[PDB]
Amino acid sequence: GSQVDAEGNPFWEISDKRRVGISQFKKMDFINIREYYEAGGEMKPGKKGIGLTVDQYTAFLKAIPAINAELRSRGHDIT
Amino acid sequence: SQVDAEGNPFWEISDKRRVGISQFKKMDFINIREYYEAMKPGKKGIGLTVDQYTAFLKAIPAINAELRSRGHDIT
Amino acid sequence: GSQVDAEGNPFWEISDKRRVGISQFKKMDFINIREYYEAGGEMKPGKKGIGLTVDQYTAFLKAIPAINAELRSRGHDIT
Amino acid sequence: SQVDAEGNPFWEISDKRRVGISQFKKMDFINIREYYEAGEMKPGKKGIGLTVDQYTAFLKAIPAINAELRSRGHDIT
Amino acid sequence: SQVDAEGNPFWEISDKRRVGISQFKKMDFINIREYYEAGGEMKPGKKGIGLTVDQYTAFLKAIPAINAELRSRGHDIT
Amino acid sequence: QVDAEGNPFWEISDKRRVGISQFKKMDFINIREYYEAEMKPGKKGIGLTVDQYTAFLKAIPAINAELRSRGHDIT
DNA sequence: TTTTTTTT
DNA sequence: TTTTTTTT
DNA sequence: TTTTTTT
């Protein structure tokens, strides 16, 4: 479910140490997919990851049906 | 719908950026990564497991919702 | 018996590819039963497995006598 | 000690986690697995299936792991 | 005299049993093992034994005795 | 050397024997690990049928060849 | 300069 | 949305 | 004290 950090930036966990988040930066929005490390009971973002510009994420959303199909063909249950 | 040098399929999301599926040791990963010209993979990027990629997928409608409310159009 | 992984964590082999290990996360102890894969030297933990809270583990331990009894009535020897 | 739909026995280790024995390809398995609800209770992705040899190797390690857990402050009978 | 998927030599002795040489932790092992089919590719199974080079050589020393006893029980050995 | 059953055996290590036995009318050539109490046979090990053992014997020169070229010393 | 741990 | 398998 | 988001 949709959580929020200190800055009020929304994130969703996709692992125990991996998130997707929306942050703002130099007037633009960025969708980040990144590993988090633990630092003093809190979670900071780490070097392993990628920040998507809004358009790069929408190009991504369009390749999803093709990705989904190929996965199934390899025996995965994609709902 | 392209196919790379290894034989894995990809989809360009930028001049330098790709989404792909690769198999490393019988195991499947969904990679989102920057590429530089040799076209080799670089520092920025992430290798998602299937479980991780499906968790992502379930979060997508809400992400789009929050993206929308910040003024972006997603279909 | 108690071998130590790269990061100081105790593990016990139960197979050439499966292990039980103790490790910390969010400052709490987790008992992991997980299969490992080889990679450029060391065995690293894999995606196939389950990680137990300590109470989950002690609940398992409470179930062991009855499990042993049921395996024996299927002709397995259990020391 | 309870019985599932497949008639197998299980012991609950938490609200959505189970340990149980099953037969499959005339072999016995120790299963430690997450379950989810569906009109009723189905096994999930997270989990492992132990061959009895693997399970007996486990049993052998228990006193050692138990000692470790006590040295970290856990109460383990 | 054929080579497996990993790249090691082996010899069949049954329908599902191989003798093979593999390297592990810098030492050579001679495995006498049962294999199963899986992904159309025979993989090593639970049943078998891995010999260190010293155990295999000790084993070769015991062969003429083994052969003798088998012959007296009526088996032919070349 | 003879074990408790009456079978002959040959030590190939401090805990490992080669022995011949006779179960259910056939002859087995056993390569097995044994353990203390009065030694008794362990799970780890393999019992060959005479045929498999003869197939084994044919390989031996080829195996010795392989090991020798890995610098091992075999008479 | 790619690619597999950790609950409620 | 299950269920395995070398190497002293 | 001990590396580490954002084209």
Numbering used by the authors:
A (entry chain C), C (entry chain A): 38 to 116
B (entry chain D): 39 to 76, 80 to 116
D (entry chain B): 39 to 77, 79 to 116
E (entry chain F): 39 to 116
F (entry chain E): 40 to 76, 79 to 116
What do the authors report?
Sub1 orthologous proteins, including the human PC4, have single-stranded DNA (ssDNA) binding, DNA unwinding activity and multiple functions in transcription and DNA repair. Nucleic acid binding is the key factor for Sub1's function in DNA-dependent processes such as transcription and DNA repair. F77 is conserved in all Sub1 orthologous proteins (Interpro domain IPR003173) of nine key species, while W89 is substituted by tyrosine in the proteins of six species (rice, mouse-ear cress, fruit fly, nematode, budding and fission yeast) as well as MoSub1 in Magnaporthe oryzae. In order to determine the effect of tryptophan/tyrosine substitutions of PC4 orthologous proteins, we have determined the crystal structures of the DNA complexes of the PC4 W89Y mutant and MoSub1 and analysed the effect of the W89Y mutation of PC4 on DNA binding affinity.
The structure of the MoSub1-DNA complex was determined at 2.7 Å resolution by molecular replacement. The asymmetric unit (ASU) comprises six protein molecules and three ssDNA chains. Each chain of ssDNA is bound by two monomers from two different dimers of MoSub1, which differs from the PC4-DNA complex in which PC4 binds to DNA with two monomers from the same dimer10. Nevertheless, the ssDNA is still bound by the same DNA-binding motif predicted by the apo- and PC4-DNA complex structures. Each protein subunit contains a curved five stranded anti-parallel β-sheet (β1-β5) followed by one α-helix, which is a key element in the dimer interface. When chain F of MoSub1 is superposed on the DNA-free structure, the RMSD of the Cα positions is ~1.0 Å, indicating that DNA binding induces little or no changes in the structure of MoSub1. The only distinct structural difference upon DNA binding is in the region of three loops (40, 60, and 70-loop), which are close to the DNA binding surface. The major interface with ssDNA (dT4 to 8) is formed by three β-strands (3–5) that are linked by the 60-loop and 70-loop and it appears that a number of residues in the interface, including F62, Y74, P82, S60, and N69, close in on the ssDNA upon interaction. Most of these interactions occur between the bases of ssDNA and aromatic residues, such as Y74 and F62 that are conserved in the PC4-DNA complex. Among them, Y74 of MoSub1 interacts with a single nucleotide in a similar way as Y89 of PC4 mutant.
